Amino acid sequence: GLPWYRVHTVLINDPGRLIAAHLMHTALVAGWAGSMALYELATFDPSDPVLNPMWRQGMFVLPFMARLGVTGSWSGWSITGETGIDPGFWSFEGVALAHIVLSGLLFLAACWHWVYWDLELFRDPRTGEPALDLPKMFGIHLFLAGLLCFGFGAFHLTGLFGPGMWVSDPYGLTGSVQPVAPEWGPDGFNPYNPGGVVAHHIAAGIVGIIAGLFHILVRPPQRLYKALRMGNIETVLSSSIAAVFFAAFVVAGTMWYGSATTPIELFGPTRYQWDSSYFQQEINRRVQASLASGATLEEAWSAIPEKLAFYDYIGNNPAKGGLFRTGPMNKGDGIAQAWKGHAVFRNKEGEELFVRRMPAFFESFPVILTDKNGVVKADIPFRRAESKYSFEQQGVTVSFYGGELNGQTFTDPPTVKSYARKAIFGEIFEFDTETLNSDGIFRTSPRGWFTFAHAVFALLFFFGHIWHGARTLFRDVFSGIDPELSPEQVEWGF
Amino acid sequence: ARRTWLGDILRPLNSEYGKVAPGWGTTPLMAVFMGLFLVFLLIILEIYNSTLILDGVNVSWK
Amino acid sequence: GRLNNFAIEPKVYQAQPWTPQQKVRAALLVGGGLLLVAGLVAIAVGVS
């Protein structure tokens, strides 16, 4: 008699089979976490963390393990790349097999709670009906959540009993798992301060313990018990869906804009680090501070590491992607191998030309070379347009300082046209297009897939909140039977 | 029904099923605490949006 | 014909004034929790 979209609603009136369904759902989430960790442990290349990190290989579950302290595997490498350590038991494989045996134990308990469904704990002794004490249940669950919040913050992230969290520099060059101290003061509300996260779990754990003790001792008032329809299980589902879509919007925001909990060594750079030209200013500042101390252009550009120039490429920011362009970024343009260098362009008289960079909003951008003032000197015309400022009339050459090509000057105009077409993308890199059969089309980060998936999930959970709050408050018209009348009613006649 | 051991240990917690406080109870305390949480959420949003700049708080990667 | 399923809510009754049995358990809740949070701010100092 039930339709297909209502078959799960047989668990409304029995608290033990609802425990069985929740235990199965949790067995499913822990089994996905172990399986995802095993599948990412299989197809991982920990042989080059400079130009092939885990955000380039499409590793999605790998950074949430490595963010809280899981460095190193049992095979004998590390995320930082030292190729010999003893991590103990808690490797990537160790926590994968831990979630696998946890998924099995929760499945066995779901089977027990489904068979032995009718207990004394779920019934009242007076009536025969099943009843749950929700205003209390929120107190024991809030006391437990605040106890584990304070425990995780005050013992894990301080490193008093645990590893730290992932902390990095402002440019993602030197970053590992270090214990971080809680920041009391206004700097703890800076999202890029890691001390505010620790101070946050200490403080919110103490407030959660205080409020859980408040509900374990104080009953709700009658006015909002009848207003917010407590005693129904569906108001709890309504307000929980509200809190969870608020939380999914917050994590999509802190994933996209970046914070101390989403660093670029694990998840990749952001699109606002390209939009402000964040690494290019640091690269230019480092080149100028090398040039001030008596260096050539080759010695200044050769001291720049390849990781800082790999953050200055348009194929790494997550706003250059596609919705059905699937897989890693190394399917997108190939595995990076080496930094070629800084392409410097001249104009047959000695004037330095600057390639106009591609902004993220463009799927294709015209190659345009300007001066320091912004006067367009040379370009590549469209297909067969009358070339007035062409690369052969203007005599454009290209020089490569630092990197793979050091001091090599290329004068022949198809090679200068190809290097300018690559130089609209930022810094130029050598890409192993084979061994993954890579196309030339850019893919997106795990940053972009996380932000996409949980903005969509938060928007759909808003509709789920509307539907469930409407089903909660309007119970007597959706059913036909008022909830405050006892169902064992007789009749009188008139 | 089954009278298990954990059913007898965890019973006092599932015992007051519809026990309410009379009247308005602690609703003005809840209302001023919700107003404090609203001002807190506002401050945190205007710090991240940088429309509330503080002394020593530089909202960037620094 | 299509059936549905809703929740059977418990009967709303007001909370009575307590007894020693529940008053001393509320007292051993509050006096436990105050020294618990008084220990937690000491751990919060010792980790900062």
Partner: peptide, 23 residues
């Protein structure tokens, strides 16, 4: 230096029992 956390466990672990019993 000063045993702040060391003795804090005792005041934080004994409190848990109080709640558990009175529960």
């Amino acid at each position: 230096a000063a045993a702040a956390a060391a003795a804090a466990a005792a005041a934080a672990a004994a409190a848990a029992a109080a709640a558990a019993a009175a529960a």
